[PDB]
Amino acid sequence: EPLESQYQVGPLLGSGGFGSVYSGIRVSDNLPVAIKHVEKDRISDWGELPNGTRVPMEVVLLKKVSSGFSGVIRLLDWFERPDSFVLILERPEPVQDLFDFITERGALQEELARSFFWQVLEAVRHCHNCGVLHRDIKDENILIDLNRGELKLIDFGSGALLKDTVYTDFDGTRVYSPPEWIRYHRYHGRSAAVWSLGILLYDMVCGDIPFEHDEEIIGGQVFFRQRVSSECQHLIRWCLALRPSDRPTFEEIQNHPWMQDVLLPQETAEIHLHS
Ligand SMILES: [Cl-]
């Protein structure tokens, strides 16, 4: 029953809006885990389990996406404390988050960006198929398993149940948010997710995000400061179309000429990561 007997807690990995995240190991089988604490007072979006138990919405969303194998970090267990919730999540080892990876290594070769972007797309499709919208897709919320070449999506703390009607709330990362949110405080889930995927793809191939200020986001003029292929540029510009209805569907992204002949995760690691 006690989390403290069930888990050996290691160092703090970081903290922020998502709470405080620690490295841990599951005592029974030495499974590497991440242990995430959030103060109850600090929780904005609440949900409830089938049994009517009151939980953070994050737990509800995680349960929906954690069935079977996927490119999403799975929730293994969770605990309620008097003043907080503690979530036990998978932890890849060895691992590096994609923000850190890009910061250290610079712009990614297109072959590598293709492999990573494809995997992110498959993970996002998985979320949507499970009825969950992440709402904070960005480099820092993607973990790279450096040995397996697998990417894993993290931090559902800004997410929502996926719906076909308009969203009028948002607490994700502003520089990845779409022009319709900035201008009108309104967006739809899939088309907003595609915008954020455009920002991410640009970040991968350029080594930095395309827009900093609101006026740039709504201007949507995409300038490339690095050499990027015409097909890649086309896909980015399409994802970053100003009118949400002008953006590609997930099918249209994965059928784009830039996205053909993707490497497998293992070969991605052998070529680009082992070192
Ligand atoms: Cl917290």
UniProtKB/Swiss-Prot annotation:
Top EC class, one word: transferase
InterPro entries for the chain: Kinase-like_dom_sf, PIM1/2/3, PIM_Ser/Thr_kinase, Prot_kinase_dom, Protein_kinase_ATP_BS, Ser/Thr_kinase_AS
Residues noted as binding ATP in the record, renumbered to the chain: L13, G14, S15, G16, G17, F18, G19, S20, V21, K36, E90, D97
Gene Ontology annotations of biological process type: apoptotic process; cellular detoxification; cellular response to type II interferon; negative regulation of apoptotic process; negative regulation of DNA-binding transcription factor activity; negative regulation of innate immune response; positive regulation of brown fat cell differentiation; positive regulation of cardiac muscle cell proliferation
Effect of Y22H: In a colorectal adenocarcinoma sample; somatic mutation
Active site feature: D136
Documented EC number(s): 2.7.11.1
Induction of expression: By interferon-gamma (IFNG). Strongly induced in leukocytes by the JAK/STAT pathway in response to cytokines. Induced by different cellular stresses, heat shock and cytotoxic agents.
GO molecular function: ATP binding; manganese ion binding; protein serine kinase activity; protein serine/threonine kinase activator activity; protein serine/threonine kinase activity; ribosomal small subunit binding; transcription factor binding
Post-translational modification, as annotated: Autophosphorylated on both serine/threonine and tyrosine residues. Phosphorylated. Interaction with PPP2CA promotes dephosphorylation.
Gene Ontology cellular-component annotations: cytoplasm; cytosol; nucleolus; nucleoplasm; nucleus; plasma membrane
Keywords: Apoptosis, ATP-binding, Cell cycle, Cell membrane, Cytoplasm, Host-virus interaction, Kinase, Magnesium, Membrane, Metal-binding, Nucleotide-binding, Nucleus, Phosphoprotein, Proto-oncogene, Serine/threonine-protein kinase, Transferase, Ubl conjugation
Cofactor requirements of the protein: Mg(2+)
Subunit details: Interacts with RP9. Interacts with HSP90AA1, this interaction stabilizes PIM1 protein levels. Interacts (ubiquitinated form) with HSP70 and promotes its proteasomal degradation. (Microbial infection) Interacts with Epstein-Barr virus EBNA6; this interaction upregulates and stabilizes PIM1 and induces cell proliferation by inhibiting the growth suppressive properties of p21.
Function, as annotated: Proto-oncogene with serine/threonine kinase activity involved in cell survival and cell proliferation and thus providing a selective advantage in tumorigenesis. Exerts its oncogenic activity through: the regulation of MYC transcriptional activity, the regulation of cell cycle progression and by phosphorylation and inhibition of proapoptotic proteins (BAD, MAP3K5, FOXO3). Phosphorylation of MYC leads to an increase of MYC protein stability and thereby an increase of transcriptional activity.
Name of the protein described by the UniProt record: Serine/threonine-protein kinase pim-1
Native source species: Homo sapiens
Taxonomic path: Eukaryota, Metazoa, Chordata, Craniata, Vertebrata
